[PDB]
Amino acid sequence: RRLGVMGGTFDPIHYGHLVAASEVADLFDLDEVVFVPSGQPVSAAEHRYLMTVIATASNPRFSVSRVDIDRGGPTYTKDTLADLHALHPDSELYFTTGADALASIMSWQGWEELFELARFVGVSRPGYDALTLVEIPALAISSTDCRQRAEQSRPLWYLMPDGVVQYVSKRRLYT
Ligand SMILES: NC(=O)c1ccc[n+]([C@@H]2O[C@H](COP(=O)([O-])OP(=O)(O)OC[C@H]3O[C@@H](n4cnc5c(N)ncnc54)[C@H](OP(=O)(O)O)[C@@H]3O)[C@@H](O)[C@H]2O)c1
Ligand SMILES: [Cl-]
């Protein structure tokens, strides 16, 4: 059994993330991908959790975990991987996040134990065994650009699911 772990802030989640998760699951024959919004270091954790639930609900092989949000302090991936390993003891873990996030991995706590717990996948827009880098054209879509568009009342339609567009708008997240 093989479980993707999509780690990120997801403020907001967008089609880039969803495309990336879908491709990585196909590339590595993953049975499921669990999205793990990171803890409060940015919109409140509950907003980021709900947007990610909204965005992933329709995919039978996506889910969302609260392990980082409910942990208590800032998020360290050694703790995310320990929590998920305890929850899914039989699954091989494929930790997936932005390649630019993973460029600082040598400063993350438990750097050596991280690779005992998971294989790592860095996804990026084009032109960027233990770490595999994967280029995803749809990751040209960025959460920063999404927040700026919302701030400027420019449309978010087709950059993320309709439910996320409307959540961002009616909860006034970036205005
Ligand atoms: N001490 C540690 O253990 C440590 C330190 C740093 C990070 N991390 C972990 O690394 C993950 C990423 O951290 P972060 O969100 O802080 O990164 P970030 O700095 O917000 O993101 C950096 C880049 O990665 C992209 N990105 C982030 N998550 C992604 C995903 N799941 N798929 C595709 N692109 C992604 C971002 O694009 P968007 O803005 O479009 O998402 C951005 O281009 C989190 O799970 C975090 O807990 C751990
Ligand atoms: Cl879920």
Query: Cα–Cα distance between 126 and 16 in angstroms, integer?
Result: 12
Residues lying with their CB under 5 A of ligand 2, a single-atom ion: 63-64
Does residue 9 have its Cβ closer than 6 Å to ligand 1?
yes
Does residue 58 have its Cβ closer than 6 Å to ligand 1?
no
- Ligand 1 centroid – CA 163 distance (Å): 23
How close are the terminal C-alpha atoms of the chain, in Å? 43
- What separation in angstroms does the CA of 88 have from each of 78, 84, 149, 163? 15, 6, 38, 29
Residue type, 163: G
Q: Whose CA is nearest to atom 30 of ligand 1?
A: 97
Q: Which structural domains are found in the chain, ordered by start?
A: 1-175 (3.40.50.620)
43's CB contacts (< 8 A; 6+ apart) are: 11, 12, 173, 174
Does residue 124 have its Cβ closer than 6 Å to ligand 1?
no
Please name the method used to determine this structure: X-ray
Rg (CA), the chain: 15
25's CB contacts (< 8 A; 6+ apart) are: 4, 32, 33, 61
CB crowding 146-164: b at 16 or more within 10 Å, else e: bbeebeeeeebeebbbeeb
- Ligand 1 centroid – CA 153 distance (Å): 26
- Ligand 2 centroid – CA 65 distance (Å): 7
